[PDB]
């Protein structure tokens, strides 16, 4: 328990812990955006191919 | 291996910091996308609100 | 390895390389997401150019 800086290791273990939790929320959001984007991207081809044709 | 261990820890501090900042960037990039779209959304809404039930000048109302 | 520290460290080392990857994937996704949002804007943009000046004309003969 003398080697390394010791406390920094657990403090680090701690943030990386937080970091990973985040990637999950962002990965979550990213995917939620992608659904909204496409939902909109559909809503547009309506007033795209239709219009006057 | 003792010096080698210290060495590693310091490098992870650097590495962990790089991720810390890289996450703030992304969380931010992701926020532009969120807004950018909702804008398209609002615009398109106007458009889409002109299609069904036409509105194009001369004696509109 | 055989001490609580030496291993806690080689674990994080591992954990950190994972988060590095999840990031290269994350960054690549927003990128795609962005190039896909901007192309929808080009549709919307051109759906507009036609709302205004059609290019399609009609004549009774």
């Amino acid at each position: 328990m003398e080697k390394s800086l010791v406390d920094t290791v657990y403090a680090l273990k701690d943030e990386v812990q937080e970091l990973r939790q985040d990637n999950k929320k962002m990965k979550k959001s990213l995917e939620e955006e992608q659904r909204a984007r496409k939902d909109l991207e559909k809503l547009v081809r309506k007033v795209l191919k239709n219009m006057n044709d | 291996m003792e010096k080698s261990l210290v060495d590693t820890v310091y490098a992870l501090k650097d590495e962990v910091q790089e991720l810390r900042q890289d996450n703030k960037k992304m969380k931010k990039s992701l926020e532009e996308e969120q807004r950018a779209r909702k804008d398209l959304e609002k615009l398109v809404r106007k458009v889409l609100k002109n299609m069904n039930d036409p509105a194009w000048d001369e004696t509109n109302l | 390895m055989e001490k609580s520290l030496v291993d806690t460290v080689y674990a994080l080392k591992d954990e950190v390389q994972e988060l590095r990857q999840d990031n290269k994937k994350m960054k690549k996704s927003l990128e795609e997401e962005q190039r896909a949002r901007k192309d929808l804007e080009k549709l919307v943009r051109k759906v507009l150019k036609n709302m205004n000046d059609p290019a399609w004309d009609e004549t009774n003969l």
Binding site: - | - | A55, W56, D57, E58, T59, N60, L61
Partner: protein, 107 residues
Amino acid sequence: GSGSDYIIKEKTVLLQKKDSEGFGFVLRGAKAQTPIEEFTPTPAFPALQYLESVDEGGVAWRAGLRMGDFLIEVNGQNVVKVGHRQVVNMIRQGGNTLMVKVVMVTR
């Protein structure tokens, strides 16, 4: 048997009408003269113009012309890749007379 077939015809008709009437059809298609549009006369969209509507009982109908029939030639000049506002101007030139060649497409 649902594969995919076409009946790409190519009838040519002769039209005339009294100043007291019109050939009886709505011409629709892309303008031009200085286009940025696509010019691919593929077996899909024969020509820029086409008969969007043909009045039932009027001249154009009394000569086979029908809805969908793409406008290939107005008298002489080949109008397949000519702009709307141009193909029109032509059509008029021939006052109350109009020689035209178009093509039907069944599916």
